[model samples]
Target: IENLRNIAIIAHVDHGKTTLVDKLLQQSGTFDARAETQERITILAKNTAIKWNDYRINIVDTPGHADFGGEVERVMSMVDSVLLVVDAFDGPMPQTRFVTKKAFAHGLKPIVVINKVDRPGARPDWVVDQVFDLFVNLDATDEQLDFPIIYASALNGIAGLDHEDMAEDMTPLYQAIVDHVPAPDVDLDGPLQMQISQLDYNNYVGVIGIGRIKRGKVKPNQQVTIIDSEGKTRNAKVGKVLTHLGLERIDSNIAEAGDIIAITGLGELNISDTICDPQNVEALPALSVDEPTVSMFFCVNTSPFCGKEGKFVTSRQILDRLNKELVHNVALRVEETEDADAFRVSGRGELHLSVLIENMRREGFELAVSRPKVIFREIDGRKQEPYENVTLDVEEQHQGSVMQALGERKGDLKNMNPDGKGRVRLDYVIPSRGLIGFRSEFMTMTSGTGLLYSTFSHYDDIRPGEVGQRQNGVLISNGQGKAVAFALFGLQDRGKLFLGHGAEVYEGQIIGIHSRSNDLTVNCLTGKSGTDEAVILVPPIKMSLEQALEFIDDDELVEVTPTSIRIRKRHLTENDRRRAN
Candidate 1:
């Protein structure tokens, strides 16, 4: 294990964790300069290797968002240390607390990287002190308290021993890992043992289990017993063994202890399964993933325009797609409803579930989804709901409005401070139900300049009233037809129109937000007469998939197809809505 060092880079979102991976690949000479593609977006944990002074450092670039905390937790099992990247300007955010706590719990030492040191108004020293406090708050041991700190500008490809000592390359950070991070304690002659912490899918080779070998060397075509978390064992053969080397998965006939490797041919395998010698069968503790906080009803599109633009429209197709998702999305939950046409899908957060919906839409799936609702549970004979810790960084000018908005949603103010420059950062503990539609409103309030991040905190008693819901109403379509420019021109006084001229609108379909707090139906079929003058309609509001998801209310649904995103009442027809009422 002297030549190997397995570590994971963990940090808050936008703290330059991913950017540092690019720099690591570049400075280590492992980068493929011949590659033609430049775009890079890493979601799940991606494995890459670096060679520095005769050491093979295996780096796992993990997603920093709390929604993917599962990725961070499982990654801790493979690594002996963590490279906790913190922005010099924005130090120790919520996710910093989240990931570091998980890392410390796994008994991993941390090497703090104060990234973005070159940014104006950077405070590396202050950030270090804050990190010290964070570690103390997490009850870190004496060994964990003495963490090494490295300052660097990830964007410029430079690192430093301290905040001021700048080097030409990333050698300072690389040397720290080699010198400080302890080598894994592995029994080279022990029985073959490896616990699958992550999974990958290949259409040709099928499911691949990725993990670090904890003991004895594993060879190609070796016989092993897969001991599940429940102690059930099944015999299997290693179809192929692949090891990570410099951003590529190189085929290997064998991989030794302490090396991260992938194995194929483990059909029906799952995360947390232990693959060991059949004679020495053993089981590893299961990885506990964070539970989903929000849920939504995904139903087969029953809109009047259903089946007009999508290839996958049947409930069976939808069910099959969800089942496929469960293979890799360990944090996602899907439950069948009494109605065959609808299913309740739950995930870590709104963005988490929305990503799945967005993927399905791109794959030509058509469905309608209800507004997100908080998942509740019974505890000690009382109803309880999830709560979240929200952190907001916004300009000082908008502080009062932001605070008031959150206060109205039952957010308890925890801390407020002046972030660097003219920005103010506010921290709050709010019920998860209060955040259902707060994103769209927050952006509008901040004029699109504010930054917000939230993570699940805990579950408490049920909230008193209906928290954080839309107060304003919507403008619904009165008839089925193409939108007339003249009619839209007359309806310009409406709060915001979702579509512009010539867009299709069906009966009961929501076309715009009403200026008042009550819903209204407007006739879009009113056309301009061919007289002397013509009326011009103003440009309509454009809503992205995320905005559409946020803007919809409980009574309304967002109809998602490969071609369109339309908001409409659950009951499409006016009479049908009245009858339901």
Candidate 2:
């Protein structure tokens, strides 16, 4: 137990949390000796950041994506300390601030890791100073201000105290943590209190509750009461306890406090719930997590492709599946819509909800989701909406365009600076509305090289104006059939095509982005019975999904399944959409 260190790497999306953890795991000899020493991003580190082998360092690599912020929230609760990674050039962005604040709230001190030191615009000195400023801004105490700062290019696996002093292994970072991260303070002999951090599913073993023991020893056959943060308790017996050993869980009969372990006992316990001895009856305070920002009406798919592709095609199946999700994910909220055919599911962002769609598709559950809409809240008896602290890094030449676009959406620029290269870094406190449909266009304006990240900011009085929406309605297919190459080639002049030659299509399906601002139904399934002259007028067209996502507007929803990605209107049919309007 002497060398045991439980820590999580927290940062903005794409800021290298996973990459840094990859280096840490490799340097610790936790990986196979013959395994490739490449520094790939490892998300599993988030679970390992606790007591596994006493000699091995356990790290949790939580997601920076807003949708999965729930995962990060639980990760912060499990660790005693955090490795905060901020891009050396970009400084502290939203999610970095978001996660760091969560860690501080959990009484976890942070060790600053200013990553990407080898890049052209890297500024290790400035970022370090910025981190100090952020600590104060987050209301850090004197003890927290004394956090150790390390610099490294995680992609290259070099970590050190100075930018120029990069080392071959991340051993320096590990040693720094051991030197600085105080061992977890737990009352090993006190009454039991363990909060489950994650709900893990296994095919052979069913469900598992994973978390670190905050106090006392837990042994097999021990009678314990599962206590909710609300003071409700249910008696259960310890069936199995397991500790982490690298990526695998080392099963055991008992696990002591200060050790991270998973228990397989109560089928009813969830994330943020406490496990304690019945006589003790102590419970930790409830976890504070942000509510989902976007909501969509999820329903069983009723299209031509519904039953052809998935097994769970009924409304009953959709509701049951979502009910299962709510058991594990506190951040996920689902409700019954007025119509039994549809259910509403809300979450943090597009990616957050999209991942759910992706997972269901893999399980052969076909469901239709409406477009993402921002959820509003009421504050001070006034309508209030979420805002984002958006930060962007772009080439100097594209700064004017970026500013002009965001300006139209009511983005208020707060800070701007040259990133010590031919690029400019801009900060804006933009309303959530301003960002709704701007992602695809932002990439086009920046030629796909501009980097953008945003985190939830304080809510403000509702903005008086609309921010962004898709201008053009989609080109829908009028009939159900396979998409023909000749018809698609002819429609290329009309607008972009989503499907290739011989692809499947259905009536009322959005086939492509419209050339004009109105939804226009087209015959994508038109076969080659007509003259070649008409097809020649249409230019040859090819559409891959990567390009399509960057081209859609906020009014649209990308229909994603395990094998297909289709863009659709919030309301599926033309007639029903018109009637609703």
Candidate 3:
């Protein structure tokens, strides 16, 4: 335990935490310098260990986005300290607030790293002040307040105690972590006790539990008692014991307290379950995960083109896939609805749900999803809704339009200040319901030049009125056929189209947005009898999965397949829609 230092890297999105970890691995000689480099954004917590001067450093690189906060929360129990990364130019953001608070609650002191220091207009000193202020605001302890600071350009593999005295490699940052971060404190003579913080699976070994041994030692084929959060007990035998070395886990003969390890043959263990010697049965306190705030209906695709491009299309397949997802994704909640074909899926936010949908699509699963709705709660006999702390950085010229759009969505402005570089930073607290479809609008208003970040703040009284409803209706196809260019040219004046020539479309399929406030049924397959002039049309607007999810209305569903994403009405026929209305 004296030679082991366990630390987690925490940061906001795009703040270079993963890049910093890459430098650490390369400089430690764990990876060959001749290996080709590839870029990646971490979606889950990853574990790596490297030897630095006879000490084994176990590093956990956590996801930077707030949607993966569940990963950050549980991993906190396995580490003794954190490397809080902050961009020198952007300073602290909303996600920074979220991760820092969680780290402080876990009693983990932070080692601050001011990354991207080589960028132009980077203010390292100012960012240090801001970080200090944030810690004070978060009620950090005195020891946490005095955090060690290191400046580095992670992409170039350079770091230094002083910005101007940069070293050739990442020696300064590695030395800082070794010097400041404390080793794990645990009893070596006590009974064997460990809590599973993460789960993995293999075809050979049914389930794998990854966690730190809080006390005593464990070995392969050891008999242990599993105690759940509710005091339930079961006896199980441990299989192969493994430890991290770089990115791979190798077999270890024995693992002791303060060592993060993985074990197999544990037969489907849940997160936060304690495994102890059969003589002493004890359970660790369950980690508190933030509740899901947004919900949507995930239904089996019942459209006319359901089974065309997918391998799994039945309700049973979808249900089984979701149950498999529940094995590792602790932040997601799935409930069976009254309709057998549909399930209510809840998650942290739109990105969280959209990521799940995209994963399923890539795995050849076809399903339909309804528009996202904010999950509401009843507290103290009053209706309550989730609120978000929103932060935006935009140019001065585009600030008014962005603020106006947010105000229309019932956003209450909290603070607005100039960044001293001809840009404005705006902060607001808005209900989660009002922020569902605001991303596309925000991008349009800023011309895709602004930065926006939001995190769940707290629950408050529900807003008074309807917010963020679609302003214009859509053009529904009247018949099923291939769309021709001549017919599309004639309908150019209606509004923006979502399809071009030779695109297959069906009746009730959303083809375009109507210019007016009412839905219009249009024919896009007719050919001209006598063409005097060549047909010309505007290029259609293409949307990705997240954009399609944000664009649909309450009565519409996004049909997801392996090859295509289509939007259609809940009722396939025009007459059926009219009757339902």
lDDT by residue (51-90, candidate 3, tens digit) is 7877888988765554455567778888999888899988
Give the per-residue lDDT of model 1 (tens digit) for 1-581: 77899998777777867678777766777755335333434442478787776888998876556445566778888899999889999987754555676789889999999999999999998999888877876679999999889898877788988677699888899989998988877888889999998878777788888998888888778899999887888999888899887777878988999999888987877778999998888786877445688899999999889999999999999999998997678668899989999999998778888999999999999999998888789988989998887778788999999999999999999988673447776879998888777877888999998777675677899879987567789989989989988788777766678887889889989999888988887898776455537676667777787888888877799999988999999877777877976
Colliding pairs, model 1: none
| Residue 157 lDDT (model 3) | 86
The candidate scoring highest on TM-score is 3
**Candidate 2 per-residue C-alpha lDDT over 54-85 given as tens digits, one digit per residue, 9 for 90 to 100:** 45566776566633445666787777788887
- Which window of 10 residues has the lowest lDDT sum in candidate 2? 537-546
How far in Å is the alpha carbon of 175 misplaced in model 1?
Answer: 4.4
Angstrom error at residue 298, model 2: 4.6
Clash pairs, candidate 3, are none
Error of 2 at 326 (Å): 8.4
Ranking by lDDT, best first?
3, 1, 2
